[PDB]
Amino acid sequence: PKCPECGQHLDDPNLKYQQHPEDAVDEPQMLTSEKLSYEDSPMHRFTSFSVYCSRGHLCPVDTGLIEKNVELYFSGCAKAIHDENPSMEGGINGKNLGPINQWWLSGFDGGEKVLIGFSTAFAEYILMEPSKEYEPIFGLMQEKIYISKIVVEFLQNNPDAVYEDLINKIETTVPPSTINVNRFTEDSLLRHAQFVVSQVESYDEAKDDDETPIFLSPCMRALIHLAGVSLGQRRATRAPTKATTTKLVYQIFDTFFSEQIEKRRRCGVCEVCQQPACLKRRCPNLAVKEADDDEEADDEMPSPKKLHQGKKKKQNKDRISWLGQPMKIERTYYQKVSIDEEMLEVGDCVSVIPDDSSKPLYLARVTALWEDKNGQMMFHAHWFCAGTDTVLGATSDPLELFLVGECENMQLSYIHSKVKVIYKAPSENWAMEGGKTYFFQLWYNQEYARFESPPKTQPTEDNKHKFCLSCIRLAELRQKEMPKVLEQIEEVDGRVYCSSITKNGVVYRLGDSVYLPPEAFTFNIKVKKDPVNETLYPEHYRKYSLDAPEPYRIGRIKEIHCGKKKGKVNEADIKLRLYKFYRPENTHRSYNGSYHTDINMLYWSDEEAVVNFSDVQGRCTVEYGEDLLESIQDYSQGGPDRFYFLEAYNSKTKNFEDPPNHARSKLPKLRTLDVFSGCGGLSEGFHQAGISETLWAIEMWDPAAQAFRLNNPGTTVFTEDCNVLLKLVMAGEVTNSLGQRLPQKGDVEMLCGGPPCQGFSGMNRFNSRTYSKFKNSLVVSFLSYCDYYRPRFFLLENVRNFVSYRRSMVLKLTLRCLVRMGYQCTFGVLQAGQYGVAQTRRRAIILAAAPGEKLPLFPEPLHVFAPRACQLSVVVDDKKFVSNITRLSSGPFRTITVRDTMSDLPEIQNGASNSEIPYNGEPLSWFQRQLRGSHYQPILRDHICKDMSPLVAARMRHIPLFPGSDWRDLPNIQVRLGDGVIAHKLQYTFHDVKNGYSSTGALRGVCSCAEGKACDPESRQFSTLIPWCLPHTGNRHNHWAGLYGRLEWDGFFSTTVTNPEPMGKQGRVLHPEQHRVVSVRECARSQGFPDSYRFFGNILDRHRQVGNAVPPPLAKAIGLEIKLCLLSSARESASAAVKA
Ligand SMILES: [Zn+2]
Ligand SMILES: [Zn+2]
Ligand SMILES: [Zn+2]
Ligand SMILES: [Zn+2]
């Protein structure tokens, strides 16, 4: 019993038949009425409507029957186009009104004007209210339509919105009384995914701009993949931001566009492709792939080859003759001047023509001039680097050269011409200056991509002739790397026993402690599943289609025994006898040691080991706790590489005895402005490192600016657009609107900030479209703040991919900009997890130091972390750039786990709303002890989590506790959803040709596409415990591994969480044990925020605050590198005040 025209089942109890009114005259006759008074189709209103098949069954319109060619007829009261009355008053009745040509919509912009309309070969109709009988059908259609309105209006306002932003928008929208639904959930969006998506695509075709289609925003692409959407199904129709630049900054971006600015695998299958300068044949399937592809980068390639090592051509010899008297005599005889038709003097610059493999004319500075024992007239060439050959490439000034550590001896014959090379030195008031020939400003380090201030070491009279800065640089480096013996005692055999040695500029005496790889030495050693019920766990079959290393070994120096090279000591074969230290985990305690133990603590062991000095990783202080003048806490925080012991451990007895007797015995706070401050995470870390004071912050979002105020009372927190506050200082205004005191030149010592990269964040080459955005971006505004203020220190923090955006053009242009201003600058990727947080998050960091200060290094990882997460290198124009970081893999401390992070917090349930609750317990882990304080605090603030819908909540309760459990572990069971609502079972009705049958011979398919056919809609199940969408799109998305996943106690957070959603893109977000999502505080702990840190606004505002922040431990680490630059520069002036 099915309809041969509309398909509807006759046994369906919701089926209804059409009932005509009397008047009911057919379409043509109805249309010739005087009740009626810009298109060749009469437009009229239409109330009390009903849609039906030739057989008379009331029909939906949204179901695609019209498209499947099925003739649909209608009836009701036709009224006048201006008549707003939804009653059958001023109107004629019509019946079986001509087969519906197509249906349409309008009002996707202005007011709540969403009008539904029908089109017939006779006329156009603007549907008013439906008939009694047809009302429920038009009712479901009304829902579908409202959701589509919310989505479209939200996307016009908020493009760039992420999946979690949409879910919140939908969940939060209060539908009018007229809609039969109380509120829309994620379950609704998934149910009407095909409708919504096809409507969002329709809006794009309809109103036309040069702007990005709305179906391509992140939330929309996330929906398309998660739900099983078929793109391309067509339907219905109906001044730019200016950056406050400085002259300098403007010209860089201006003089880049005005140069570099130049100018397809379509699916075929879709309805868009299957249609014919008219063009709107833009394949949605290709568009999605392209947009998804543009979001991915390339993370290994060899060390870049050193320049100037190619062949050179010789110039013809006319007259080459020395002028003046020899400067010195060494087998070699130096001279101040030489003749080569014209005059060349020690210190001039020359051009050397190479074997033109690209034709780039080589440039050098004439270091020395001499005549070798064979009468060959030589010169030493200290090579220059063309800007187009530094990281900068094409963006650089073509007249700009750079100093390098590249120099070689050559015959005077290679010289083609003497070249004028000017040093563009900084002014006396370079700091107050904010707004032809070859020149150079900086010294470039190819490997690490550091532009720094020229050495400024002047020639001694002993080497006034031979003076090469590259030779001096190489010298220092070779002698620092060198393993040399400082003081030697007495030899036994052919091995000399010493009291002190050195390497990497670190001095190692006897009794000092050392770091070593875990493979250096050893300690004293130690010594199958059953079938699943597949009817109950039908998705578990999907469960099957390198971890963190060990921290350093530690030992105290007993002997420095050595070897002998014929005459003296064999500097290479320095050996070390050491006393082994155990970490509580190394001990029989193992994993049970590592919990409550101070990350700092060790145990003494009379055990001995011999290793090479070449394996020593560094020095560290291991002291006895009872022979300490301060408390362990005071000691441990006092400085880096500080470890302690209070007991000793006998491996044989497995006992802890007291240790033996032989085991015993101002900083300038830079005045900071933090643009795009947030709640102050970066300001916090920098405050902890002691290097700063944040007196000014700029944050446009009220809840964040409020939260920054709470935590920094001394700060002037501006909430105006930074572009306005800049135009205001560049006008002499001393105060803003509220009368807040504007910072001026000299006030700001350090400038930091995280500029958003809104409309250009993508990997492909620039366009007219993408450049436009970047040209006036906050990156441009931020660089301008740097140019006007001329701060001593600068930091631009961002997502790691900032380094790869637009073929690295965002990075290259940022560096070029810093260079034109005259700054020492560099870049690097850092992994948050390596500095003490239970989270994998990389960040691009752009450091800059003013001429006069020194350019800081990137900090050495303090924590051992998984290698997969620590991919720190950057490819720029197919050359591999690396930072000064040496600790590739290892480090002094064990990883910080989710357990360390939150194992102390008291239980909370889903929807937990009390912001101020007792702790109900003491801290457990070392980490917890740190963020809580070494005292008593009563209140636990922000241990608050989202009230998830009864459906989500029920799923969370059914996720098991075993580490690694996600949605694949859910049971296929009916659950009473708190209210009247009942979460039903997922029906397996299709074959999965690729996945086979279950162990019970059951089907695994959930949609017709599992069999290779097209999707059959309304095979689409909703309000199921196992979400229908997941088996639907599983095979193409790695079985959505992690979705509804609980964090592992031993694990970490996947990324910075800003809004936890179980089917989102922010990773495993459920609590390891409790039937809820991670709390605001749990996230704050993942970010290494002290427990006393304050947040502001509603729950979501507090989640976004926490998640948007730079983790304070990463900022402390960076801050401490600034510490060394300050200390080092403060003592350099002091050891020069004496010489003056
Ligand atoms: Zn029918
Ligand atoms: Zn297509
Ligand atoms: Zn040299
Ligand atoms: Zn399907």
PDB file of N, CA and C in Angstrom, residues 486-487 498-503 505-516 521 553-560 575-581 602 604 609 611 613 616-624 635 640-643 645 662-665:
ATOM      1  N   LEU A 486      90.884  22.638  32.058  1.00  0.00           N
ATOM      2  CA  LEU A 486      91.248  23.854  32.781  1.00  0.00           C
ATOM      3  C   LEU A 486      92.395  23.658  33.784  1.00  0.00           C
ATOM      4  N   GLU A 487      92.217  22.723  34.731  1.00  0.00           N
ATOM      5  CA  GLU A 487      93.185  22.426  35.777  1.00  0.00           C
ATOM      6  C   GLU A 487      93.315  20.920  35.937  1.00  0.00           C
ATOM      7  N   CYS A 498      91.865  15.211  36.412  1.00  0.00           N
ATOM      8  CA  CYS A 498      91.608  16.659  36.494  1.00  0.00           C
ATOM      9  C   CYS A 498      90.607  17.126  37.541  1.00  0.00           C
ATOM     10  N   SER A 499      90.636  18.442  37.815  1.00  0.00           N
ATOM     11  CA  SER A 499      89.742  19.123  38.740  1.00  0.00           C
ATOM     12  C   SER A 499      88.733  20.071  38.038  1.00  0.00           C
ATOM     13  N   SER A 500      88.894  20.330  36.698  1.00  0.00           N
ATOM     14  CA  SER A 500      88.016  21.176  35.852  1.00  0.00           C
ATOM     15  C   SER A 500      88.260  21.098  34.330  1.00  0.00           C
ATOM     16  N   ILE A 501      87.143  21.084  33.561  1.00  0.00           N
ATOM     17  CA  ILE A 501      87.007  21.006  32.093  1.00  0.00           C
ATOM     18  C   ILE A 501      85.933  22.001  31.596  1.00  0.00           C
ATOM     19  N   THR A 502      85.791  22.200  30.256  1.00  0.00           N
ATOM     20  CA  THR A 502      84.794  23.110  29.641  1.00  0.00           C
ATOM     21  C   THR A 502      84.432  22.726  28.198  1.00  0.00           C
ATOM     22  N   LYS A 503      83.185  23.047  27.806  1.00  0.00           N
ATOM     23  CA  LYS A 503      82.584  22.923  26.476  1.00  0.00           C
ATOM     24  C   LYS A 503      81.300  23.761  26.457  1.00  0.00           C
ATOM     25  N   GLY A 505      80.838  26.656  26.439  1.00  0.00           N
ATOM     26  CA  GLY A 505      81.059  27.783  27.334  1.00  0.00           C
ATOM     27  C   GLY A 505      80.618  27.541  28.760  1.00  0.00           C
ATOM     28  N   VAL A 506      80.490  26.260  29.145  1.00  0.00           N
ATOM     29  CA  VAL A 506      80.048  25.872  30.483  1.00  0.00           C
ATOM     30  C   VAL A 506      81.204  25.177  31.161  1.00  0.00           C
ATOM     31  N   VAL A 507      81.536  25.600  32.396  1.00  0.00           N
ATOM     32  CA  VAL A 507      82.642  25.043  33.180  1.00  0.00           C
ATOM     33  C   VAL A 507      82.147  23.895  34.069  1.00  0.00           C
ATOM     34  N   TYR A 508      82.839  22.744  34.004  1.00  0.00           N
ATOM     35  CA  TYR A 508      82.527  21.525  34.754  1.00  0.00           C
ATOM     36  C   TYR A 508      83.679  21.124  35.724  1.00  0.00           C
ATOM     37  N   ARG A 509      83.494  21.369  37.034  1.00  0.00           N
ATOM     38  CA  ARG A 509      84.469  21.023  38.085  1.00  0.00           C
ATOM     39  C   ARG A 509      84.066  19.676  38.703  1.00  0.00           C
ATOM     40  N   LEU A 510      84.857  19.140  39.662  1.00  0.00           N
ATOM     41  CA  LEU A 510      84.536  17.887  40.369  1.00  0.00           C
ATOM     42  C   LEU A 510      83.422  18.166  41.385  1.00  0.00           C
ATOM     43  N   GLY A 511      82.509  17.218  41.558  1.00  0.00           N
ATOM     44  CA  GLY A 511      81.399  17.385  42.490  1.00  0.00           C
ATOM     45  C   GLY A 511      80.212  18.160  41.943  1.00  0.00           C
ATOM     46  N   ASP A 512      80.365  18.769  40.748  1.00  0.00           N
ATOM     47  CA  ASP A 512      79.289  19.474  40.044  1.00  0.00           C
ATOM     48  C   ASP A 512      78.456  18.365  39.375  1.00  0.00           C
ATOM     49  N   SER A 513      77.134  18.566  39.193  1.00  0.00           N
ATOM     50  CA  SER A 513      76.284  17.537  38.558  1.00  0.00           C
ATOM     51  C   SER A 513      76.025  17.719  37.044  1.00  0.00           C
ATOM     52  N   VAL A 514      75.670  16.610  36.365  1.00  0.00           N
ATOM     53  CA  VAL A 514      75.540  16.592  34.923  1.00  0.00           C
ATOM     54  C   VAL A 514      74.293  15.895  34.343  1.00  0.00           C
ATOM     55  N   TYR A 515      73.833  16.371  33.161  1.00  0.00           N
ATOM     56  CA  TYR A 515      72.746  15.791  32.381  1.00  0.00           C
ATOM     57  C   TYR A 515      73.382  14.903  31.302  1.00  0.00           C
ATOM     58  N   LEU A 516      72.709  13.802  30.959  1.00  0.00           N
ATOM     59  CA  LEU A 516      73.156  12.825  29.971  1.00  0.00           C
ATOM     60  C   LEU A 516      71.956  12.154  29.318  1.00  0.00           C
ATOM     61  N   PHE A 521      73.809   5.453  30.662  1.00  0.00           N
ATOM     62  CA  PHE A 521      74.015   4.390  31.633  1.00  0.00           C
ATOM     63  C   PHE A 521      72.723   3.637  31.954  1.00  0.00           C
ATOM     64  N   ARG A 553      69.560  11.778  32.239  1.00  0.00           N
ATOM     65  CA  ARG A 553      70.081  10.982  33.339  1.00  0.00           C
ATOM     66  C   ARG A 553      70.786  11.994  34.205  1.00  0.00           C
ATOM     67  N   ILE A 554      70.908  11.760  35.509  1.00  0.00           N
ATOM     68  CA  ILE A 554      71.622  12.732  36.342  1.00  0.00           C
ATOM     69  C   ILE A 554      72.666  12.051  37.230  1.00  0.00           C
ATOM     70  N   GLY A 555      73.862  12.634  37.262  1.00  0.00           N
ATOM     71  CA  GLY A 555      74.989  12.147  38.043  1.00  0.00           C
ATOM     72  C   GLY A 555      75.891  13.251  38.536  1.00  0.00           C
ATOM     73  N   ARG A 556      76.517  13.024  39.708  1.00  0.00           N
ATOM     74  CA  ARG A 556      77.495  13.920  40.333  1.00  0.00           C
ATOM     75  C   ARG A 556      78.892  13.424  39.964  1.00  0.00           C
ATOM     76  N   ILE A 557      79.782  14.364  39.582  1.00  0.00           N
ATOM     77  CA  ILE A 557      81.154  14.074  39.139  1.00  0.00           C
ATOM     78  C   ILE A 557      82.033  13.555  40.281  1.00  0.00           C
ATOM     79  N   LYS A 558      82.626  12.344  40.079  1.00  0.00           N
ATOM     80  CA  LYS A 558      83.547  11.656  41.005  1.00  0.00           C
ATOM     81  C   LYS A 558      85.008  11.823  40.518  1.00  0.00           C
ATOM     82  N   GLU A 559      85.282  11.465  39.246  1.00  0.00           N
ATOM     83  CA  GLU A 559      86.599  11.561  38.607  1.00  0.00           C
ATOM     84  C   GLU A 559      86.479  12.181  37.208  1.00  0.00           C
ATOM     85  N   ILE A 560      87.530  12.906  36.772  1.00  0.00           N
ATOM     86  CA  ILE A 560      87.686  13.449  35.412  1.00  0.00           C
ATOM     87  C   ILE A 560      88.995  12.771  34.949  1.00  0.00           C
ATOM     88  N   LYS A 575      86.973  11.454  29.898  1.00  0.00           N
ATOM     89  CA  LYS A 575      85.953  10.551  30.420  1.00  0.00           C
ATOM     90  C   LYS A 575      85.551  11.008  31.825  1.00  0.00           C
ATOM     91  N   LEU A 576      84.357  10.574  32.307  1.00  0.00           N
ATOM     92  CA  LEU A 576      83.839  10.978  33.618  1.00  0.00           C
ATOM     93  C   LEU A 576      83.282   9.814  34.407  1.00  0.00           C
ATOM     94  N   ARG A 577      83.735   9.667  35.668  1.00  0.00           N
ATOM     95  CA  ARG A 577      83.223   8.655  36.590  1.00  0.00           C
ATOM     96  C   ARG A 577      82.210   9.403  37.430  1.00  0.00           C
ATOM     97  N   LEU A 578      80.966   8.883  37.515  1.00  0.00           N
ATOM     98  CA  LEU A 578      79.881   9.577  38.217  1.00  0.00           C
ATOM     99  C   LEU A 578      79.059   8.723  39.182  1.00  0.00           C
ATOM    100  N   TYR A 579      78.488   9.372  40.212  1.00  0.00           N
ATOM    101  CA  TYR A 579      77.585   8.743  41.175  1.00  0.00           C
ATOM    102  C   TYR A 579      76.179   8.880  40.575  1.00  0.00           C
ATOM    103  N   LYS A 580      75.457   7.757  40.386  1.00  0.00           N
ATOM    104  CA  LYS A 580      74.120   7.722  39.773  1.00  0.00           C
ATOM    105  C   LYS A 580      73.022   8.290  40.655  1.00  0.00           C
ATOM    106  N   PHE A 581      72.190   9.173  40.111  1.00  0.00           N
ATOM    107  CA  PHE A 581      71.023   9.664  40.834  1.00  0.00           C
ATOM    108  C   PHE A 581      69.791   9.002  40.221  1.00  0.00           C
ATOM    109  N   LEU A 602      65.254  14.032  43.490  1.00  0.00           N
ATOM    110  CA  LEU A 602      66.085  12.888  43.107  1.00  0.00           C
ATOM    111  C   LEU A 602      66.388  12.058  44.357  1.00  0.00           C
ATOM    112  N   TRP A 604      69.769   9.650  46.089  1.00  0.00           N
ATOM    113  CA  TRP A 604      71.197   9.355  46.021  1.00  0.00           C
ATOM    114  C   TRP A 604      71.439   7.845  45.846  1.00  0.00           C
ATOM    115  N   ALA A 609      79.164   5.117  37.396  1.00  0.00           N
ATOM    116  CA  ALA A 609      79.111   5.061  35.942  1.00  0.00           C
ATOM    117  C   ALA A 609      80.204   5.877  35.270  1.00  0.00           C
ATOM    118  N   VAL A 611      81.085   7.576  31.552  1.00  0.00           N
ATOM    119  CA  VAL A 611      80.612   8.093  30.269  1.00  0.00           C
ATOM    120  C   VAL A 611      81.554   9.181  29.714  1.00  0.00           C
ATOM    121  N   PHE A 613      82.660  12.826  28.007  1.00  0.00           N
ATOM    122  CA  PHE A 613      82.337  14.242  28.167  1.00  0.00           C
ATOM    123  C   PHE A 613      81.493  14.728  26.989  1.00  0.00           C
ATOM    124  N   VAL A 616      77.692  14.605  27.795  1.00  0.00           N
ATOM    125  CA  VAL A 616      77.206  15.554  28.785  1.00  0.00           C
ATOM    126  C   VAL A 616      76.334  16.579  28.051  1.00  0.00           C
ATOM    127  N   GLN A 617      75.104  16.780  28.551  1.00  0.00           N
ATOM    128  CA  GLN A 617      74.133  17.688  27.963  1.00  0.00           C
ATOM    129  C   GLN A 617      74.158  19.056  28.573  1.00  0.00           C
ATOM    130  N   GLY A 618      74.645  19.137  29.795  1.00  0.00           N
ATOM    131  CA  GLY A 618      74.741  20.395  30.510  1.00  0.00           C
ATOM    132  C   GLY A 618      75.057  20.184  31.966  1.00  0.00           C
ATOM    133  N   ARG A 619      74.963  21.246  32.726  1.00  0.00           N
ATOM    134  CA  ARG A 619      75.261  21.192  34.142  1.00  0.00           C
ATOM    135  C   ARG A 619      73.971  21.415  34.891  1.00  0.00           C
ATOM    136  N   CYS A 620      73.900  20.911  36.125  1.00  0.00           N
ATOM    137  CA  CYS A 620      72.738  21.078  36.976  1.00  0.00           C
ATOM    138  C   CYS A 620      73.147  21.007  38.423  1.00  0.00           C
ATOM    139  N   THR A 621      72.392  21.678  39.273  1.00  0.00           N
ATOM    140  CA  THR A 621      72.662  21.732  40.686  1.00  0.00           C
ATOM    141  C   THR A 621      71.817  20.724  41.435  1.00  0.00           C
ATOM    142  N   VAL A 622      72.462  19.691  41.985  1.00  0.00           N
ATOM    143  CA  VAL A 622      71.805  18.703  42.837  1.00  0.00           C
ATOM    144  C   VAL A 622      72.357  18.943  44.238  1.00  0.00           C
ATOM    145  N   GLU A 623      71.503  19.396  45.155  1.00  0.00           N
ATOM    146  CA  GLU A 623      71.908  19.718  46.516  1.00  0.00           C
ATOM    147  C   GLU A 623      71.152  18.890  47.544  1.00  0.00           C
ATOM    148  N   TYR A 624      71.695  18.790  48.771  1.00  0.00           N
ATOM    149  CA  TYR A 624      71.058  18.063  49.862  1.00  0.00           C
ATOM    150  C   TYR A 624      70.099  19.022  50.578  1.00  0.00           C
ATOM    151  N   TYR A 635      64.519  27.426  47.332  1.00  0.00           N
ATOM    152  CA  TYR A 635      65.674  26.942  46.582  1.00  0.00           C
ATOM    153  C   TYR A 635      65.312  26.648  45.129  1.00  0.00           C
ATOM    154  N   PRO A 640      67.434  28.054  37.387  1.00  0.00           N
ATOM    155  CA  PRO A 640      67.266  26.844  36.569  1.00  0.00           C
ATOM    156  C   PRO A 640      68.202  25.690  36.900  1.00  0.00           C
ATOM    157  N   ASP A 641      67.777  24.463  36.512  1.00  0.00           N
ATOM    158  CA  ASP A 641      68.490  23.187  36.648  1.00  0.00           C
ATOM    159  C   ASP A 641      68.735  22.777  38.116  1.00  0.00           C
ATOM    160  N   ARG A 642      67.867  23.252  39.022  1.00  0.00           N
ATOM    161  CA  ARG A 642      67.967  22.955  40.450  1.00  0.00           C
ATOM    162  C   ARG A 642      67.171  21.699  40.865  1.00  0.00           C
ATOM    163  N   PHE A 643      67.887  20.651  41.310  1.00  0.00           N
ATOM    164  CA  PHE A 643      67.346  19.378  41.797  1.00  0.00           C
ATOM    165  C   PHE A 643      67.733  19.173  43.264  1.00  0.00           C
ATOM    166  N   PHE A 645      67.818  16.167  46.952  1.00  0.00           N
ATOM    167  CA  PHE A 645      67.679  14.828  47.544  1.00  0.00           C
ATOM    168  C   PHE A 645      67.698  14.917  49.050  1.00  0.00           C
ATOM    169  N   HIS A 662      79.865  12.000  52.382  1.00  0.00           N
ATOM    170  CA  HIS A 662      80.531  12.544  51.190  1.00  0.00           C
ATOM    171  C   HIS A 662      79.559  13.207  50.169  1.00  0.00           C
ATOM    172  N   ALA A 663      78.237  12.948  50.304  1.00  0.00           N
ATOM    173  CA  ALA A 663      77.192  13.533  49.463  1.00  0.00           C
ATOM    174  C   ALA A 663      76.884  14.994  49.872  1.00  0.00           C
ATOM    175  N   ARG A 664      77.198  15.358  51.128  1.00  0.00           N
ATOM    176  CA  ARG A 664      76.987  16.671  51.734  1.00  0.00           C
ATOM    177  C   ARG A 664      78.135  17.662  51.370  1.00  0.00           C
ATOM    178  N   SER A 665      78.196  18.844  52.059  1.00  0.00           N
ATOM    179  CA  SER A 665      79.225  19.890  51.884  1.00  0.00           C
ATOM    180  C   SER A 665      79.991  20.272  53.187  1.00  0.00           C
TER     181      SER A 665
END
